[PDB]
Amino acid sequence: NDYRTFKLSLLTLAPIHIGNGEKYTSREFIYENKKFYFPDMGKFYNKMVEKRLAEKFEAFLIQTRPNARNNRLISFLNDNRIAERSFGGYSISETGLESDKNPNSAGAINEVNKFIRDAFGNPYIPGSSLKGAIRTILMNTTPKWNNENAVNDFGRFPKENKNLIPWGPKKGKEYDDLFNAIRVSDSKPFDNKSLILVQKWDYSAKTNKAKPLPLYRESISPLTKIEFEITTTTDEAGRLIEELGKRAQAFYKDYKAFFLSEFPDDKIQANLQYPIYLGAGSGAWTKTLFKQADGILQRRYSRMKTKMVKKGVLKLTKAPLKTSLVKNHESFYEMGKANFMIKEI
Amino acid sequence: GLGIKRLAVVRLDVDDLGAAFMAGFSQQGNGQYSTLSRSATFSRSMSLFFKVYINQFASDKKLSIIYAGGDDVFAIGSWQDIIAFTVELRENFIKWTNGKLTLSAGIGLFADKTPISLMAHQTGELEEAAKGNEKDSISLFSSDYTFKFDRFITNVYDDKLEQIRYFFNHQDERGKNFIYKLIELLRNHDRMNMARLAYYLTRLEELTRETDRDKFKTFKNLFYSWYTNKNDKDRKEAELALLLYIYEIRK
C-alpha cells in the first residue's frame, strides 16, 4: 500500500504548554497543601449558595484586599470555615519552585492557563500542534521555501502570501497537496500526574537578569515519552518525513547560531535526540520563518512593550529538575524544547 | 433518433384576401387600375400559386397537404418538414407577391393518435390568434409563442437556432440540463432572474474545460445580450429557439 506509516516518540526536556484558550483567574482555585485544587466553579457556587453565603462571595470577588495570602479563595474557605473540598474538576500537585516569593506567602499564583483536554478528563497533545511544529522545520530547512514567501507590500505589508506550499484544489491541475500527504495523528491521552504549572521567566539581554512574569501556564512534566503517528501517502512526503531527523538538526543549527547565541550557554539545554520546538513559550522565532521575519516582526510592536531591538527576549521557566536535563543551577528550562525520534513501521 | 415523436399541423391563410379582392388595385392611382383584366389575372395568379405550386414547395418533405387553395391551407405532416415548409411557403410568397400580401400561419404540435378534429380546431385557434397578433404573424405551437414571419424566419429559425446548434454540437460538457434550465429562466422571468442568470452563466463559464472556454464565453455574453436587451422581442425568440433545439435533440 502507498500509505507508509511511521511512529514518532517525543520526549519532554523542557515543559510544553499547548493552547486550550481559557484560563482560571485569581479566585478559581484552592491550595490546601502541595496540591492546587481546580474545581468546577459552577458546582462550587451551587454548593456554597446553600448557606446564603454567596452574597458574601459577591463581596470577596471584587475585594482587592492586600497581602495576597488573603486573596486566593483559600482564605475565603479558611475564613467562613467551608471545609469539604469535594467539588469536581482536577487537582494537580505543585511544581514546587514557581513561588520566588517568601515561604508561606507562597501559593499566591494568579492566572493559570489550562492544558488542552478531551472531554473525559484527561489531557493529550493534539496532532495539529505537532503538525504545525513540523511545518516550520520543513519550511525553514527547504531553502526554496524561504526566499520569496513574503508580503510584496500588498496591504500595509505585514502579511505573508501563504501560497508557496502546494495548497488547494487548483482547477485543471492534478491534486498535489504535499501537506495533505503528511497526516499527523493525535497522541495517546495521558494522565494529569505530569502537569506542574510552570511560571514564565523572561531572561533578556542588555539587562542580564531573569525578571519573572505573572503568567503561570500549566505544562508537561519533563521526561515524558509521548506517542505519535505520521502516516504519509506520497513518496514526496516520504522524503521529507525521512529527512526530518536531519532537517531538525539543521533548523536547530541555523537557530542556535542566530538567536540562542548572544545568550549564555548555561541557560541552554542539550538535545539527546532530534530537536523540536513545540508550542506556547518557545517564542516567535520557532513559530516563524525567522530568517526573513527579522525586519517584519518588529514592525508590529509599536506599543507599550516593544521588542528590545531585534531578537529581544529568551523565555525560560522553572520545573523540578528531573534527569540531568539542564547544565545549570536553579532549574531554568527553555519552555518548549522537546526531542523526537522517528521510525518507519 | 434526433427528434421528438410528434406531428405538426399548419393552417396558413393570406391576411386580408377580401381586402385584396374588393379594393385590391385601387390603392395605386386614382381608381384607374382596379379593372377586369388585372382582377382576373391576379385571381388566376393566386390560384396558380396556392393550388399548383404548393406541391413544388412540398416535394421532398414528409407531409400531407390536406386542403389548399383560395387563401386557406391546412397541411398535416412531420414537424420539422411542416416548419420548413411554412418557411419555404412564406419565403416564396413574398418573392411572388413582392412583399405585399402578408400571410399568417399557425402551427400546432401534436402527439400521435390524437384525433384530427381536436387537432384542426386547436390549430385554427392558433391561426386566428396569429391573425389577431398583428396583420402578419406565425403562432408556433401555443398562444404565447407568437412572432412575425419577418422575424421568425430570419432571427429565430436561421440566426438564433443555427447559433445554438453551432455552439452545442461542438462541445461535450453541457448537455440537455443546461438547456432545460435556460428555458426555465426564460419562461419564469422576473427582473431577479436576470441576476440569477448572470450568476449562472458566470459560474458555468469557469466550470468548463479551460482550453475551450471562449466558446462558452462568446455564447454566454450573447445569451446575456438577448436576455437583458429590454425590447421584449429578443427573449421569446431565444425561448422558442431552445424549444426547437430540445425537440431536435430529443432521443
Binding site: 473525559f120 478528563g121 504545525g132 516550520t136 513574503a150 497526516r183 493525535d186 | -
Partner: protein, 217 residues
C-alpha cells in the same frame, strides 16, 4: 431468487472525527465549524454519504486499472456495488449504506462526559509577523461507538459475484481503518475501528456460515 444481507459493524472512534456542516447563524465567539448532528437528539451522526463516498475513493485508487478521472469510469468491480449513472445496467446501487447514529449515549455518560462533542481551539500561526487566527471546530469525542448498518443486495444477476464482493466490502472496511473518515484528517480526526463485522441476512434465505469467516480474518 432475491436475498438481502446486512453488516452490523460498530464504528469505534479513535481520536474522534468532525464531519462538517454549514450554519449561517452560529455565533461571534463560539463554534464556526460544527459537526453534523441529528436535529432532535443532538447527537453527532456519521452520515452514510461520507462513508460511501470515502470507500468509493479508497477502492477507486485500488480496484481500478485505468486512472478513473470521474465516477462513471470505475472498472465495474466498483460500479456494480456503488452504481454508475452513465452505464446502462449498473444504475442502481446494490449497496445501501446507512447513517451511523451514535449508540453509546449512555456508556459515555458513565465516564465524566458533560457534552457529547468537544470544542477544540485551533489557531493559524502566520509564519511572518507570528500572528494567530483562532477558530473553534467541534468534534465528536474519543470513546464513541456508532451502529453501522450496511445492506447488500442479491438478485439473479449474481451468478458467481456474491462472495467476490466481500473482498470489496472488507477491503473498504479495513482501508477506512487506514484513512481518516472525513474531517481535517491530516491533523488527526480520522482513525476508527470497525468492530464486530457480523453479516446476517434480512430478506430471503442465504447461507452466511461461510461468510462470517472472511470477516474475522
Amino acid at each position: 431468487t432475491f436475498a438481502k444481507i446486512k453488516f452490523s459493524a460498530q464504528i469505534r472512534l479513535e481520536t474522534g472525527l468532525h464531519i462538517g456542516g454549514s450554519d449561517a447563524f452560529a455565533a461571534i465567539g463560539a463554534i464556526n465549524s460544527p459537526v453534523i448532528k441529528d436535529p432532535i437528539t443532538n447527537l453527532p451522526i456519521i452520515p452514510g454519504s461520507s462513508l460511501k463516498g470515502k470507500m468509493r475513493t479508497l477502492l477507486a485508487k485500488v480496484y481500478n486499472e485505468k486512472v478513473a478521472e470521474k465516477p462513471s469510469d470505475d472498472s465495474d468491480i466498483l460500479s456494480r456495488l456503488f452504481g454508475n449513472s452513465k452505464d446502462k445496467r449498473f444504475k442502481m446501487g446494490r449497496l445501501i449504506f446507512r447513517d451511523a447514529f451514535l449508540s453509546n449515549a449512555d456508556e459515555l455518560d458513565s465516564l465524566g462526559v458533560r457534552s457529547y462533542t468537544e470544542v477544540k481551539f485551533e489557531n493559524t500561526i502566520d509564519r511572518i509577523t507570528a500572528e494567530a487566527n483562532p477558530r473553534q471546530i467541534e468534534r465528536a469525542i474519543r470513546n464513541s461507538t456508532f451502529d453501522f448498518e450496511l445492506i447488500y443486495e442479491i438478485t439473479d444477476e449474481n451468478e458467481n459475484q456474491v462472495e467476490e464482493d466481500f473482498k470489496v466490502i472488507r477491503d473498504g472496511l479495513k482501508l477506512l481503518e487506514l484513512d481518516y473518515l472525513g474531517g481535517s484528517g491530516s491533523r488527526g480526526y480520522g482513525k476508527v475501528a470497525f468492530e464486530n463485522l457480523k453479516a446476517t441476512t434480512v430478506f430471503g434465505n442465504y447461507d452466511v456460515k461461510t461468510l462470517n469467516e472472511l470477516l474475522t480474518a
